[PDB]
Subunit: 202 residues, 6 copies
């Protein structure tokens, strides 16, 4: 029930999945439980709305919300592999009850972007030789903010530039596109379906 | 009931028609239904007004609204073919219920502008040898925004610079102007009447 | 009842008159109706005030009498300065005046026609040679560059309602201290958009009274 | 009851007096009427306040000019006074008018003399010593055009001028009053009047 | 009950502790008493909130509030010692009843930053040879403001750039990290626990 | 009951004292009365608050003005083994703010300030600790900008603000107990005056 081979979708998923498996420690009398930070893809406004809904009277925070915010042509015979160098901007937004949690989270993200982070993405159509796509992801800025009622809620937003590739729709009917990529430790993971990565904000 | 030979009109139609035939897939139980995105030419404010009227109905979105937003002299014996190098700015505005639809639409637009897209337009007066006009259309910027009540509505706006040609009114009575152009796949289509391309916002 | 020999006035009139004779076609059952776009000289705010007054429907007598108001053009001076390239007046002082030409229209079509009659002559400038003669002396030759600086596009709504485009022009002209009307009226000619030597009319000839 | 020898005051008066004697023609049945535009020195806000006071129900009030100092600074090109300090003062000359016509007349009398500057040689003499010669460049910096409405109503143009002048510490009135002359717009040596001579009282 | 080995935490504590031991003289009939200015780590807004709560007495001011406000990659095989050059921004905010107190406080801070101040930080993991980390702290700006009801309250804020090092979380369980550093007089003090430095704003 | 040897304080006093002795003439029937313009050190907002308090009427509204209010508004390191004489080149910003009932008064006041700053004004400050050889400190004070504004109810009140950059020296607190610091400086006519206590220069805004 969606354009599976969407280039855009593939990038939202790739970025979501790099940040899909981040945990935070939380010492317990019985022992150290680690919780995975759930990640959503939604406009930030929408997310904050729903977050204030969910918030009205600690299992909800911490959480990450990713979203595309801008794109453009990437100024360095026909069009698609050879494809078009595009540049997408993402806003990764971390929400947290405690400064501690925030520190853990970012300390897991930040050190890999110097200021960039490379990943090699292999995307294969049906059964042809896969295409090799070189993806530079650059950490552009950080933005720090609070929100109060009484503790209440800490928000940090990282802005990332993904330097990727775009090309006209290749129908799902004409075969689904298999995708792999190198994670933060250069480990070739395979890009999961969208439903695998993002929690439903709905 | 309008200046048919209007230069401006010819450009609004040219741009409208490049984006006139865009569809989105929509998986059914019975099977994949494809729908053509209808396109209008109207001031953005006017269009949003009428859209909120119509909205008060998933047959309405997705839709595209095109409109001229600026122009100027294009700084690289009389005046008209040899004509005057003019530069027109258009705001192409896509409105959508689902992120998916949006992704499909843009993925059909974006990859052809690197950052420009050339088209050769042939305009012929009555029966003389047609004039050859070289038209550079440049994708300048993108702008992303939402709107909510409850889902509700996604808006992306591309801004395009059309580098075209202007010249004083050549009366309809003195013969109508036949127009052709190369589409996104360098296919010589012939520019339809205005009524053919744009749905009436009225 | 006004300083006829006003340099400023001469420029307002020159600009008014370049844009004085613009028409739009208007297809009928009977046949094509051509209408001249009336032009006024007034501050833009004042003009819009009066336009909202005129456009308002107070009697049925109005209703009909209202698409007779648009289209129309409103010209006005908005800025000036010294034009950085023994006494003072012919030889005169190089001045630079800025004018805002403002087109108001019910239909996009009308607008397209109007501008397509203005725009193509400014690349980005348009030259005119103005001859101004005092009494009966040999006339002065004044070289006038008019440059189209910018365009600005905007709408206004109630229900259709009203389209506004504003061109901004730089007139590169000449200034000099008041030469009294009593000392002889100044005859003025100029080359129009097709290099045709028309003679600059009185002010009352060019602009409709906004009053 | 004021520091007569004030340098500042001397400049406010010089500028006021350059624009002190401007008239406008006004055609009548009987015949042409000339009227001198009255000029005041006051903060613009104050002047507009008092102007709306005077305006409340009016044609003997406009046209009029209001001059005022708006800024100054050191003028980057053994002790301190003649030889004095090169200062730069900014003045806002503000013309208010009922009719566009009046405005046109007024400015057409001001504007053509500033290309973009206008020089004046000011002679200031202390008691009876040899007078000091001071070279004064006045530059027309900008113009600003605006309206105001109720019904016609009122047109406002403001010229901004840079006066390049000279400053030095207070020379007491008691130690002798300072005689001042200057070249007007036609290089005519007029003598700078008292302040009360130039400006109409806004009070 | 917190990530002890947090890099971020280590820097908040280092900065807190440089400014932890500032006093002001206050001449008495019985003789000069010196009071240590208490220091907190909290968002400035939060701190001002709580400060107005506490204020509604002269035992509360003077006080300093420190907080992180921004960070970024510091543009001069894996990642962590060798670590990533990061740059953190801190807002040190002094609140005072009397101009005098303020003068004393800043005169103790300001002269050491010309415009920078170096410190050598030794961080040792368990028992390995310690790591040597060179830390440049730069005084970026100062900001002066008042607040009134009647005297009432003086606020000055110094903005500091800490040029430090970042690396992915090293678990507390894998051994706590011993930290020392050179203070303002090049004296090797050892970085205390967080609870030692900052007064609880809670 | 303060840090007497405060570097900051020393500069606030130096600046206050350069502008401490400014008068205006005021012609009378008997004869010309001169009045010294009182000077305060306080945040501008605070000063205007208190000034509106004092100004709330009848006929003790003219003994209040004219007056000057000085205040520090910014500082920074002055980019041209330990730290203190040799000290650290600092740069302080001061806002000198003149309030006046009559344009005349204002003219007199500024005409006494303005001509000495071209655009700077140098002063040599000698600061001596106890009885050692005094330190020589070269102080450039630069007039940065002027700002002109009014305020009305009916006349009412004229405000001009000069912004000055003092290029001075900073160093860590030298305790009052370890000996008070004697300070002299060259005034506007290069006359070596000695910097008074703070209480001598500024009227209490309190």
């Amino acid at each position: 029930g969606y354009f599976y081979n969407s280039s855009f979708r593939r990038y939202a998923t790739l970025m979501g999945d790099l940040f899909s498996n981040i945990q935070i420690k939380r010492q317990l009398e019985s022992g150290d439980k680690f919780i995975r930070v759930p990640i959503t893809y939604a406009s930030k406004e929408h997310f904050m709305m729903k977050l204030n809904k969910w918030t009205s009277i600690e299992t909800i925070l911490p959480r990450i919300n990713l979203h595309l915010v801008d794109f453009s042509y990437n100024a360095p015979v026909v069009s698609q592999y050879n494809p078009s160098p595009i540049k997408m901007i993402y806003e990764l937004s971390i929400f947290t009850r405690y400064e501690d949690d925030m520190f853990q989270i970012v300390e897991q993200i930040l050190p890999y972007f110097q200021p960039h982070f490379n990943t090699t993405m292999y995307e294969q159509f049906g059964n042809d030789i896969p295409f090799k796509r070189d993806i530079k992801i650059v950490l552009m800025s950080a933005a720090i903010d609070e929100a109060i009622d009484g503790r209440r809620r800490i928000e940090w937003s990282l802005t990332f530039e993904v330097n990727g590739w775009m090309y006209p729709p290749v129908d799902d009917a004409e075969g689904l596109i298999r995708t792999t990529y190198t994670d933060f430790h250069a480990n070739t993971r395979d890009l999961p379906d969208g439903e695998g990565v993002f929690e439903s904000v709905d």
